[PDB]
Chain A
Amino acid sequence: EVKLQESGPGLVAPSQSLSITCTVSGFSLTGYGVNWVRQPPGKGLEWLGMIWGDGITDYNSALKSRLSISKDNSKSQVFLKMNSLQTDDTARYYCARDYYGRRYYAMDYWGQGTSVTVSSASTKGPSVFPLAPSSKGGTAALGCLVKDYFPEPVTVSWNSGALTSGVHTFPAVLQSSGLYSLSSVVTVPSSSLGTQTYICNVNHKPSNTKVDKKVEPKSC
């Protein structure tokens, strides 16, 4: 059962430092090497470096002066540290294991990633508002408006992951305020409105905020 999970701050100020930790299980770091790969939002994949089983450490030549990669075999942790952070170091940061340990310098198993924004601006949790269903027994639409958070991202589930089908969580937009906003909708059948209750759970790791919100109509 091979797993890797990245953890780090989410927000860092320009010219400051960044420390990320990749926690692995289901295999020994004595045998397999592990890469750091980042993806700037909208754009594509950039290789940062690698730490092999034996401890040999390879860096992308263009960033070698700012990068530091280390590990602890006993605690199953791999570390990345980057200095002199500018705005275009803003990206999702992934750790990926060497493909089958064959040293082809490809990747099999990746973590889900950790988002990092580089900006002086302060963290700010979201405000959540209902998008209540109208006076339509066919198919009815409701949702949650997640407003004025920074930085990205937020994750939106429904009824603690119970309701999955019909859900559409829209990409965030940058408002003129310099804060982010998205809407998350669900297309349920008309009948289920009086009977069953709909709660949207909103998560913002950077501010450590968790907001559940009941979505009902009526009461004019």
Chain B
Amino acid sequence: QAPASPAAPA
């Protein structure tokens, strides 16, 4: 359930 890297486009 780990979200994408915070440094990545959201």
Binding site for B on A (CB under 8 A): 52, 54, 56, 102-106
Contact = CB atoms under 8 A, between A and B. Distances in A.
B9 A102 contact: no
Q: What interface size band does chain B fall in?
A: under 10
A128 B7 CA distance: 50
Contacts of A52: 8-9
Contacts of A54: 9
Contacts of A102: 2, 4
Contacts of B2: 102, 104
Contacts of B7: 105
Interface of B: 2, 4-5, 7-9
Contacts of A104: 2, 4-5
A209 B9 CA distance: 45
Contacts of A103: 4-5, 8
A52 B9 CA distance: 9
A106 B4 CA distance: 10
A103 B6 CA distance: 9
Most buried by A among B5, B8, B9: B8
Contacts of B9: 52, 54, 56
A56 B5 CA distance: 15
B8 to A, nearest CB: 5
Contacts of A105: 4-5, 7-8
A83 B4 CA distance: 32
B6 to A, nearest CB: 9
B1 to A, nearest CB: 11
Q: A-B pairs with the 3 shortest C-beta distances? A: A105-B5, A103-B4, A103-B8
A106 B7 CA distance: 11
A103 B2 CA distance: 10
B9 to A, nearest CB: 5
